[PDB]
Design a protein around this nucleic acid. Structure first.
Ligand SMILES: Nc1ccn([C@H]2C[C@H](O)[C@@H](COP(=O)(O)OP(=O)(O)OP(=O)(O)O)O2)c(=O)n1
Ligand SMILES: Nc1ccn([C@H]2C[C@H](O)[C@@H](COP(=O)(O)OP(=O)(O)OP(=O)(O)O)O2)c(=O)n1
Ligand SMILES: [Mn+2]
Length: 557
DNA sequence: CCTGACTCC
DNA sequence: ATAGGAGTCAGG
């Protein structure tokens, strides 16, 4: 039904200057993962190649690394990184079907070729899950079955390129793919493969001291409670707090009494056990996640951790970070912040450099809402609890939420919101207009033409409709800020390279960039990094970047 | 596997 | 009813 050559050796007709290429890595975490199969589709035909054969072939390897030999792929970053671990360089990726699908509509959650193919009623390819199976049942099938699947995926990519590119052009999103997301993919691949070095000696010492403190807090809690119980079970905790100790029930969820941090905080005037419990649950998360969980994913020989930045997941155009997540390392409490002392440069006499956008989404909003008062404050170039309120309000917090938030009266909360929109009447207008626009069009868009569809926005159900309306208010701002830092990464890399600096990116944290570099390059970076980030886009307001460097991530403040 | 914790932006 | 976007963990 689909002819292909199950090849024993690489031939010339496989090395054309345009091809759909499949380099199959079946493990979800592709760092140092096996490549199980290769497929090439071009004008000359369809081929399957065994990886041990192809990857040890000097012409095939040469062809992968040749930028002028153009490849169309699905999830090229997965392939590029897996190939780096195999010591092979991949260049010339001209079309990425995953990223194409993602821009057309991030809600499809497209995560295999079959799911992208569905968008264009192309069905001559199976889903990966159907071929490999699930969980403990997962496995690479017999070679002829595997070969047909990889070929069918290459065929699908080969025939789907033009239809996807055609639709992107119609949406005015083709430049967003080719000039932004695709180049970013290569940059992210570099960061992931580079990894971040960890001071395991220090992290393990922190872990030993944390275990002692946990024990102390745990016993204190039992004493206060008059009983032992599992503090980490909201159910058992609920019984202690609301049945044994008879504290007021302020909130319930579908499964029982709430013990959220917000609720516990409000119960502080009733019993001191709630403050101990909050402390215990912080310490316990530090241990389970940022000591134990982090140590489990350190590569022992190099002491490096290699995250995967998911570039086609969030509904707003942000990245996410997994296994481990390096975008949520503690910072707000000194006790947790000390985890950052364990993230260190990968070479001696190198340093960590961290730069952060000031008030990014408020500046973006000022530009898009063209609010004179707000654009004014930033032209005059004018706290953690305040920041949360600022963003709360512009993004549609209610009087109830703000009151519960600042533990103030609802009346007072409602007044505050009213005066906030008086200080910034353009913002208010922008938010009423953007909702009406979303209702009329069925989607909202960002500065660089990223899109999010909101089919729920005219629901008759109040809850459903309201959530969609708040997405209409937030997505263009959060998403526009995502566009800006992404452009900034691309320009920064180019500027680092031409100036032949050794500095390279390690992490992006939504509106921060983290690099490491030889100590000699700090003065140069102090100028180069903020300049490029600030000049990424030009808005009606200024972009402002704060920066710091130090011996460890902790000290880069 | 889901829920409800803690963590970040 | 009750700002938005994320991931990992232990418990059940
Ligand atoms: N074919 C296109 C055209 C534009 N864009 C994206 C990337 C551009 O940086 C952004 C802005 O496009 P232009 O500045 O070229 O056009 P406008 O100035 O008119 O912007 P807009 O159409 O949003 O008003 O939109 C795109 O992805 N593909
Ligand atoms: N509670 C929060 C925190 C952050 N963000 C979003 C908006 C922020 O602008 C962006 C970046 O987070 P920051 O903490 O860096 O916020 P700022 O850039 O506004 O402040 P700063 O000047 O301190 O960097 O993420 C948000 O929506 N809600
Ligand atoms: Mn910032």
């Amino acid at each position: 039904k689909m002819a292909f050559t199950l090849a024993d050796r690489v031939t010339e007709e496989m090395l054309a200057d345009k091809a759909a290429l499949v380099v199959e890595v079946v493990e979800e975490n592709y760092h140092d993962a096996p490549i199980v199969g290769i497929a090439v589709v071009n004008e000359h035909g369809r081929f399957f190649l065994r990886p041990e054969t192809a990857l040890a072939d000097p012409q095939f390897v040469a062809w992968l690394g040749d930028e002028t030999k153009k490849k169309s792929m699905f999830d090229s970053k997965r392939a590029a990184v897996a190939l780096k671990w195999k010591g092979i360089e991949l260049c010339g990726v001209s079309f990425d079907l995953l990223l194409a699908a993602y821009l057309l509509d991030p809600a499809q959650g497209v995560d295999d070729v079959a799911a992208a193919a569905k968008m264009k009623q192309y069905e001559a390819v199976r889903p990966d899950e159907a071929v490999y199976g699930k969980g403990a049942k997962r496995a690479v099938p017999d070679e002829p079955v595997l070969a047909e699947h990889l070929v069918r995926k290459a065929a699908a990519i080969w025939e789907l390129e033009r239809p996807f590119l055609d639709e992107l052009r119609r949406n005015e999103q083709d430049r967003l793919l080719v000039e932004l997301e695709q180049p970013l993919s290569s940059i992210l691949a570099e960061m992931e493969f580079a990894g971040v070095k960890v001071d395991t000696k220090r992290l393990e010492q922190m872990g030993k001291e944390l275990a002692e403190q946990l024990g102390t807090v745990e016993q204190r809690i039992y004493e206060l409670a008059g009983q032992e119980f599992n503090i980490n079970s909201p159910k058992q905790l609920g019984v202690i707090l609301f049945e044994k100790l008879q504290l007021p029930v302020l909130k319930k969820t579908k499964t029982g009494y709430s013990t959220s941090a917000d609720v516990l905080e409000k119960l502080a005037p009733y019993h001191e056990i709630v403050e101990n419990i909050l402390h215990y649950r912080q310490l316990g998360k530090l241990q389970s996640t940022y000591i134990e969980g982090l140590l489990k994913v350190v590569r022992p020989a190099t002491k490096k951790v290699h995250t995967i930045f998911n570039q086609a997941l969030t509904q707003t155009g942000r990245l996410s970070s997994t296994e481990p997540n390096l975008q949520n390392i503690p910072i707000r409490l000194e006790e947790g912040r000390k985890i950052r002392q364990a993230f260190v440069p990968s070479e001696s006499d190198w340093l960590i450099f961290a730069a952060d956008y000031s008030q990014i989404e408020l500046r973006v909003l000022a530009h898009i809402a063209e609010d004179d008062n707000l654009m004014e404050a930033f032209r005059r170039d004018l706290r953690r609890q305040a920041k949360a309120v600022n963003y709360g309000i512009v993004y549609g917090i209610s009087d109830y939420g703000l009151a519960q938030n600042l533990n103030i009266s609802r009346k007072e909360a409602a007044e505050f919101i009213e005066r906030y929109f008086e200080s910034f009447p353009g913002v208010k207008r922008y938010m009423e207009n953007i909702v009406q626009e979303a209702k009329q069009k069925g989607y909202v868009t960002t500065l660089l033409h990223r899109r999010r569809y909101l089919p729920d926005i005219t629901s008759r159900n109040f809850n459903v409709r309201s959530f969609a309306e708040r997405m209409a208010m937030n997505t263009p701002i959060q998403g526009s800020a995502a566009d800006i830092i992404k452009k900034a990464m691309i320009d920064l890399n180019a500027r680092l390279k031409e100036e032949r600096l050794q500095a390279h990116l390690l992490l992006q944290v939504h509106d921060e960039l983290i690099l490491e570099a030889p100590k000699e390059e700090m003065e140069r970076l102090c100028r180069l990094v903020p300049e490029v980030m600030e000049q990424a886009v030009t808005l009606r307001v200024p972009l402002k970047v704060d920066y710091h460097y130090g011996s460890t991530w902790y000290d880069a403040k």
